Amino acid sequence: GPLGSSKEPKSSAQLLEDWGMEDIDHVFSEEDYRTLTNYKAFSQFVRPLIAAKNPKIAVSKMMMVLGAKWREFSTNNPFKGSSGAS
C-alpha cells in the first residue's frame, strides 16, 4: 500500500506541540500575506509573537518554528506574487 513516509511534514505548530509548547492562535491572513513578503519582515513580527506564548523556549527550537512558519505562510498564501505576479 502507498504509505508515503514523507507526505505530512511537521509544521511549526506540530514542532512546537512536539516539544510540549503552545503556539500563537493567530492566523496568517490575506493582509499578512501581502505585507510579510520576505522572511526578515516575517521574523521581526512572528519571533516576538511566538515568544509571547513561549518565552522560555530554546532559540534553536524557535528558529525551527520561524522557519517552518515562513514555509506554512508561503504555503497557505494565495498571493504567489505580492504585487501581482511571481
mmCIF file with all atom_site columns, C-alpha atoms in Angstrom:
data_model
loop_
_atom_site.group_PDB
_atom_site.id
_atom_site.type_symbol
_atom_site.label_atom_id
_atom_site.label_alt_id
_atom_site.label_comp_id
_atom_site.label_asym_id
_atom_site.label_entity_id
_atom_site.label_seq_id
_atom_site.pdbx_PDB_ins_code
_atom_site.Cartn_x
_atom_site.Cartn_y
_atom_site.Cartn_z
_atom_site.occupancy
_atom_site.B_iso_or_equiv
_atom_site.pdbx_formal_charge
_atom_site.auth_seq_id
_atom_site.auth_comp_id
_atom_site.auth_asym_id
_atom_site.auth_atom_id
_atom_site.pdbx_PDB_model_num
ATOM 1  C CA . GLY A 1 1  ? 0.000  0.000  0.000   1.00 0.00 ? 1  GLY A CA 1
ATOM 2  C CA . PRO A 1 2  ? 1.164  3.591  -0.595  1.00 0.00 ? 2  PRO A CA 1
ATOM 3  C CA . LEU A 1 3  ? 2.490  4.806  2.713   1.00 0.00 ? 3  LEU A CA 1
ATOM 4  C CA . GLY A 1 4  ? 4.383  7.944  1.850   1.00 0.00 ? 4  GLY A CA 1
ATOM 5  C CA . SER A 1 5  ? 6.904  8.375  4.643   1.00 0.00 ? 5  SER A CA 1
ATOM 6  C CA . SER A 1 6  ? 7.200  11.993 3.706   1.00 0.00 ? 6  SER A CA 1
ATOM 7  C CA . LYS A 1 7  ? 3.772  13.416 2.925   1.00 0.00 ? 7  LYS A CA 1
ATOM 8  C CA . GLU A 1 8  ? 2.688  15.206 6.056   1.00 0.00 ? 8  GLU A CA 1
ATOM 9  C CA . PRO A 1 9  ? 5.668  17.218 7.313   1.00 0.00 ? 9  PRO A CA 1
ATOM 10 C CA . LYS A 1 10 ? 5.924  18.742 10.734  1.00 0.00 ? 10 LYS A CA 1
ATOM 11 C CA . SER A 1 11 ? 4.529  22.158 10.682  1.00 0.00 ? 11 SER A CA 1
ATOM 12 C CA . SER A 1 12 ? 5.640  24.853 13.100  1.00 0.00 ? 12 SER A CA 1
ATOM 13 C CA . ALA A 1 13 ? 2.611  24.120 15.273  1.00 0.00 ? 13 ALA A CA 1
ATOM 14 C CA . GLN A 1 14 ? 3.468  20.424 15.079  1.00 0.00 ? 14 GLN A CA 1
ATOM 15 C CA . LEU A 1 15 ? 7.097  21.082 16.077  1.00 0.00 ? 15 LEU A CA 1
ATOM 16 C CA . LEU A 1 16 ? 6.137  23.335 18.953  1.00 0.00 ? 16 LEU A CA 1
ATOM 17 C CA . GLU A 1 17 ? 3.498  20.826 20.073  1.00 0.00 ? 17 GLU A CA 1
ATOM 18 C CA . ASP A 1 18 ? 6.076  18.019 19.770  1.00 0.00 ? 18 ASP A CA 1
ATOM 19 C CA . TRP A 1 19 ? 8.106  19.950 22.340  1.00 0.00 ? 19 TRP A CA 1
ATOM 20 C CA . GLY A 1 20 ? 5.063  20.374 24.532  1.00 0.00 ? 20 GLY A CA 1
ATOM 21 C CA . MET A 1 21 ? 4.649  24.066 23.843  1.00 0.00 ? 21 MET A CA 1
ATOM 22 C CA . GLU A 1 22 ? 1.684  26.090 22.693  1.00 0.00 ? 22 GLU A CA 1
ATOM 23 C CA . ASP A 1 23 ? 1.628  28.244 19.569  1.00 0.00 ? 23 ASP A CA 1
ATOM 24 C CA . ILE A 1 24 ? 0.101  31.652 18.857  1.00 0.00 ? 24 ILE A CA 1
ATOM 25 C CA . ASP A 1 25 ? -3.535 31.135 17.952  1.00 0.00 ? 25 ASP A CA 1
ATOM 26 C CA . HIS A 1 26 ? -3.120 33.772 15.263  1.00 0.00 ? 26 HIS A CA 1
ATOM 27 C CA . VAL A 1 27 ? -3.871 33.027 11.647  1.00 0.00 ? 27 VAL A CA 1
ATOM 28 C CA . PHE A 1 28 ? -1.778 34.392 8.806   1.00 0.00 ? 28 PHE A CA 1
ATOM 29 C CA . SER A 1 29 ? -4.460 36.130 6.883   1.00 0.00 ? 29 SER A CA 1
ATOM 30 C CA . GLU A 1 30 ? -4.724 37.818 3.442   1.00 0.00 ? 30 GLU A CA 1
ATOM 31 C CA . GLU A 1 31 ? -3.321 41.170 4.554   1.00 0.00 ? 31 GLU A CA 1
ATOM 32 C CA . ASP A 1 32 ? -0.451 39.427 6.350   1.00 0.00 ? 32 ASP A CA 1
ATOM 33 C CA . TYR A 1 33 ? 0.446  37.616 3.123   1.00 0.00 ? 33 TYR A CA 1
ATOM 34 C CA . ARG A 1 34 ? 0.675  40.864 1.263   1.00 0.00 ? 34 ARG A CA 1
ATOM 35 C CA . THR A 1 35 ? 2.773  42.605 3.875   1.00 0.00 ? 35 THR A CA 1
ATOM 36 C CA . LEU A 1 36 ? 5.164  39.931 5.167   1.00 0.00 ? 36 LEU A CA 1
ATOM 37 C CA . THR A 1 37 ? 6.592  39.403 1.723   1.00 0.00 ? 37 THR A CA 1
ATOM 38 C CA . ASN A 1 38 ? 10.050 38.381 2.929   1.00 0.00 ? 38 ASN A CA 1
ATOM 39 C CA . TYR A 1 39 ? 11.470 36.421 5.820   1.00 0.00 ? 39 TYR A CA 1
ATOM 40 C CA . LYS A 1 40 ? 13.028 39.434 7.602   1.00 0.00 ? 40 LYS A CA 1
ATOM 41 C CA . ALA A 1 41 ? 9.683  41.249 7.720   1.00 0.00 ? 41 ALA A CA 1
ATOM 42 C CA . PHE A 1 42 ? 8.147  37.995 8.742   1.00 0.00 ? 42 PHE A CA 1
ATOM 43 C CA . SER A 1 43 ? 10.576 37.071 11.504  1.00 0.00 ? 43 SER A CA 1
ATOM 44 C CA . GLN A 1 44 ? 10.528 40.559 13.054  1.00 0.00 ? 44 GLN A CA 1
ATOM 45 C CA . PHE A 1 45 ? 6.834  40.054 13.598  1.00 0.00 ? 45 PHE A CA 1
ATOM 46 C CA . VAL A 1 46 ? 6.466  36.354 14.214  1.00 0.00 ? 46 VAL A CA 1
ATOM 47 C CA . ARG A 1 47 ? 9.528  35.948 16.551  1.00 0.00 ? 47 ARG A CA 1
ATOM 48 C CA . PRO A 1 48 ? 8.208  38.244 19.419  1.00 0.00 ? 48 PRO A CA 1
ATOM 49 C CA . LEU A 1 49 ? 4.767  36.840 18.695  1.00 0.00 ? 49 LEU A CA 1
ATOM 50 C CA . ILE A 1 50 ? 5.671  33.197 19.343  1.00 0.00 ? 50 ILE A CA 1
ATOM 51 C CA . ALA A 1 51 ? 7.961  34.321 22.197  1.00 0.00 ? 51 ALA A CA 1
ATOM 52 C CA . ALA A 1 52 ? 4.859  35.790 23.818  1.00 0.00 ? 52 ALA A CA 1
ATOM 53 C CA . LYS A 1 53 ? 3.427  32.273 24.201  1.00 0.00 ? 53 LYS A CA 1
ATOM 54 C CA . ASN A 1 54 ? 6.765  30.573 24.867  1.00 0.00 ? 54 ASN A CA 1
ATOM 55 C CA . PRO A 1 55 ? 9.361  32.993 26.318  1.00 0.00 ? 55 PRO A CA 1
ATOM 56 C CA . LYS A 1 56 ? 11.355 30.181 27.875  1.00 0.00 ? 56 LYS A CA 1
ATOM 57 C CA . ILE A 1 57 ? 11.710 28.262 24.661  1.00 0.00 ? 57 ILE A CA 1
ATOM 58 C CA . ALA A 1 58 ? 15.160 27.484 23.275  1.00 0.00 ? 58 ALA A CA 1
ATOM 59 C CA . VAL A 1 59 ? 16.314 29.706 20.413  1.00 0.00 ? 59 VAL A CA 1
ATOM 60 C CA . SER A 1 60 ? 17.354 26.670 18.390  1.00 0.00 ? 60 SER A CA 1
ATOM 61 C CA . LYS A 1 61 ? 13.776 25.431 18.658  1.00 0.00 ? 61 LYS A CA 1
ATOM 62 C CA . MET A 1 62 ? 12.344 28.895 17.944  1.00 0.00 ? 62 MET A CA 1
ATOM 63 C CA . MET A 1 63 ? 14.310 29.213 14.702  1.00 0.00 ? 63 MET A CA 1
ATOM 64 C CA . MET A 1 64 ? 12.736 25.953 13.551  1.00 0.00 ? 64 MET A CA 1
ATOM 65 C CA . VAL A 1 65 ? 9.273  27.340 14.305  1.00 0.00 ? 65 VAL A CA 1
ATOM 66 C CA . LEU A 1 66 ? 10.008 30.592 12.484  1.00 0.00 ? 66 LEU A CA 1
ATOM 67 C CA . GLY A 1 67 ? 11.423 28.783 9.503   1.00 0.00 ? 67 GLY A CA 1
ATOM 68 C CA . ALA A 1 68 ? 8.568  26.330 9.378   1.00 0.00 ? 68 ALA A CA 1
ATOM 69 C CA . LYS A 1 69 ? 6.052  29.172 9.766   1.00 0.00 ? 69 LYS A CA 1
ATOM 70 C CA . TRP A 1 70 ? 7.600  31.017 6.854   1.00 0.00 ? 70 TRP A CA 1
ATOM 71 C CA . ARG A 1 71 ? 7.080  27.819 4.874   1.00 0.00 ? 71 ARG A CA 1
ATOM 72 C CA . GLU A 1 72 ? 3.472  27.428 6.189   1.00 0.00 ? 72 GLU A CA 1
ATOM 73 C CA . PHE A 1 73 ? 2.871  31.100 5.401   1.00 0.00 ? 73 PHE A CA 1
ATOM 74 C CA . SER A 1 74 ? 4.115  30.719 1.840   1.00 0.00 ? 74 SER A CA 1
ATOM 75 C CA . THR A 1 75 ? 2.040  27.553 1.525   1.00 0.00 ? 75 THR A CA 1
ATOM 76 C CA . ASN A 1 76 ? -1.382 28.972 2.507   1.00 0.00 ? 76 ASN A CA 1
ATOM 77 C CA . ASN A 1 77 ? -0.520 32.323 0.864   1.00 0.00 ? 77 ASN A CA 1
ATOM 78 C CA . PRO A 1 78 ? -2.560 32.552 -2.411  1.00 0.00 ? 78 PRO A CA 1
ATOM 79 C CA . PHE A 1 79 ? -0.626 35.636 -3.476  1.00 0.00 ? 79 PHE A CA 1
ATOM 80 C CA . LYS A 1 80 ? 2.291  33.978 -5.273  1.00 0.00 ? 80 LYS A CA 1
ATOM 81 C CA . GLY A 1 81 ? 3.164  37.429 -6.441  1.00 0.00 ? 81 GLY A CA 1
ATOM 82 C CA . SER A 1 82 ? 2.677  40.024 -3.777  1.00 0.00 ? 82 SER A CA 1
ATOM 83 C CA . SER A 1 83 ? 2.147  42.812 -6.282  1.00 0.00 ? 83 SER A CA 1
ATOM 84 C CA . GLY A 1 84 ? 0.620  40.645 -8.977  1.00 0.00 ? 84 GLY A CA 1
ATOM 85 C CA . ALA A 1 85 ? 2.960  38.104 -10.460 1.00 0.00 ? 85 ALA A CA 1
ATOM 86 C CA . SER A 1 86 ? 5.746  35.904 -9.143  1.00 0.00 ? 86 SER A CA 1
#
